[PDB]
């Protein structure tokens, strides 16, 4: 199978640089043309360059000053970076493969790393439990969570039981807080016979920090 | 159209 | 470069309908135009590739047809996961330029949300912050009313609302609110209330709980 897997998401300082790894496999670098593209609030969808299968390389206009797209074939990863980031370059950055060798029409993607432009510093989050009642069971369905707070930068991810458990999911989109610091919340719904007999935990990894909690969320 | 970089999807 | 326009903005359709998404170009650009296919928290997906030839993998609904400067991705029959934005984007000329996007939004019947309360964990009272969470769990239409009391007093410009994007299996939403309040300011009173209004109620729900 084709796949493109990035390195993780993360903060950049302003006037600083940023640099992402691309690594494929189920196809050869020197086969195929890896391309890069980035999807911002601003300006949507904007393809950035490409390095070529003979290590030839294309950058759009606006960035030939300040990108460069590197690759080592034998390891078969790719190299973005890119000089001198403002606070407008906070974006997804992608890394994306087409069908033919010299084309662009793109039917890979890598997962995509969001980048986040600014002067903060990286803070891990808390993460308090939802606790289950009767204040929250309704007709043998009860509802439990996880309060994720106080990170920065985005993203974060959440799931379930280890991934053993996605129906009744909901992870709320993040909100930033006056403090600069982003929360949300993850629920679930499940049987309340259940709540005696399963573990419910929510795994949460915020990767710009490192930090990694497994929150059990237990009836009070 | 605003692009939302936490959900990816258009606002 | 080239400017690609997308229209409209915001589609919204009943499953089992036909829909249309069109995508327009600043100058000919033959038959040299691909579509994508963006789902929440996803990368893009592609769909057609050169106005109208079919990629594998992808369901036989999606086909698309245009060339010059008019192009158009149609869906036959609509389904739930068919919830995203839609992109276009051209390579007749360098450098290859994305279109903004079509939002595909899906109708329902009205559904009731189900509303929970949860109080704040001394594990989170502890650090000297109270959060307290009422979760308004799928419902449709997205339009909800969620009022805030404290000991009869209302709250205002205290909390925070997230809304989910459209479930593609079940096309409903979700909302959470958020009280936040210092935990001295918790202590010092007794009663929580989240009142929810939607159109699915024949009457404002309230849920509550008193401090302890």
Not at chain 3, 117 to 126: A, C, G, R, T, V
Request: net charge positive; with cysteine; aromatic share 10%.
């Amino acid at each position: 199978q084709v796949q493109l897997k990035q390195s993780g998401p993360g903060l950049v300082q302003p006037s600083q640089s940023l640099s992402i790894t691309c690594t494929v496999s189920g196809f050869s670098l020197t086969n195929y043309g890896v391309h890069w593209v980035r999807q911002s609030p601003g300006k949507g969808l904007e393809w950035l360059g490409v390095i070529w299968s003979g290590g030839n390389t294309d950058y759009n206009t606006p960035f030939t000053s300040r990108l460069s797209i590197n690759k080592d074939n034998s390891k078969s990863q790719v190299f973005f970076k890119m000089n001198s980031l403002q606070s407008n370059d906070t974006a997804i950055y992608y890394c994306a493969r087409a069908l033919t060798y010299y084309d662009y029409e793109f039917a890979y993607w890598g997962q995509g790393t969001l980048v986040t432009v600014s002067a903060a510093s990286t803070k891990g989050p808390s993460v308090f439990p939802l606790a289950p009642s009767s204040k929250s069971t309704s007709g043998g369905t009860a509802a439990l969570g996880c309060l994720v707070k106080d990170y920065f930068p985005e993203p974060v991810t959440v799931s379930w039981n280890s991934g053993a458990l996605t129906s009744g999911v909901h992870t709320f989109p993040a909100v930033l807080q006056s403090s600069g610091l982003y929360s949300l919340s993850s629920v679930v719904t499940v049987p309340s016979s259940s709540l005696g007999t399963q573990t419910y935990i929510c795994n949460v990894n915020h990767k710009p920090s490192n930090t990694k909690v497994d929150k059990r969320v237990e009836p009070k | 159209s605003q692009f939302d970089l936490s959900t990816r999807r258009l606002k | 470069d080239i400017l690609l326009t997308q229209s409209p903005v915001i589609l919204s359709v009943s499953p089992g309908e036909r829909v249309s998404f069109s995508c327009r170009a600043s100058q000919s650009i033959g038959t040299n135009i691909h579509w994508y296919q963006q789902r929440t928290n996803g990368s893009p997906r592609l769909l057609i590739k050169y106005a109208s030839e079919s990629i594998s993998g992808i369901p036989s609904r999606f086909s698309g047809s245009g060339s010059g400067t008019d192009f158009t991705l149609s869906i036959n029959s609509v389904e739930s996961e068919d919830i995203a934005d839609y992109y276009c984007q051209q390579n007749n000329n360098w450098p290859t330029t994305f279109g903004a996007g079509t939002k595909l939004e899906l109708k329902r019947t009205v559904a009731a949300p189900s509303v929970f309360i949860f109080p704040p964990s001394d594990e989170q009272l502890k650090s000297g912050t109270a959060s307290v969470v009422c979760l308004l769990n799928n419902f449709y239409p997205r339009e909800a009313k969620v009022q805030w009391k404290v000991d009869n007093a209302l709250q205002s410009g205290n909390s925070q609302e997230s809304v989910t994007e459209q479930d593609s299996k079940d096309s409903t939403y979700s909302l959470s609110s958020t009280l936040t309040l210092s935990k001295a300011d918790y202590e010092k009173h007794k009663v929580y209330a989240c009142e929810v209004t939607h159109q699915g109620l024949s009457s404002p729900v309230t849920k509550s709980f008193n401090r302890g």
